[PDB]
Design a protein around this ligand. Sequence first.
Ligand SMILES: [Ca+2]
Length: 130
Amino acid sequence: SKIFSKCELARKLKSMGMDGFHGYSLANWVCMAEYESNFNTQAFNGRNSNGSSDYGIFQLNSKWWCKSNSHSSANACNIMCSKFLDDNIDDDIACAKRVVKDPNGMSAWVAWVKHCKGKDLSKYLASCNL
Ligand SMILES: [Ca+2]
């Protein structure tokens, strides 16, 4: 039952070199996690806009990013989706890095687009000790 708090997730992704990863700040990555999953490592959504399922803290779809069975999968991260439901987000970060490499950047995550892209996040982590 791993559920993160903003500042905890931040210190975490800040130690995985995410701050500025692909030109994206640390606040953006977190902001993304807050609205995609509410910082829940076990968050699940089985009726995505597509039709598959979104897994974990970053809600990685199973049609493009991880492998399952319900349907085929490019499984571009070469890892089973269930891994994204366990409490060590070490392997979810590695796959979220692959995602931002695609043409649409962090817009791959609709929630980040809805409540993060157009917002002023200069103080989003101000209360955090990093
Ligand atoms: Ca994991």
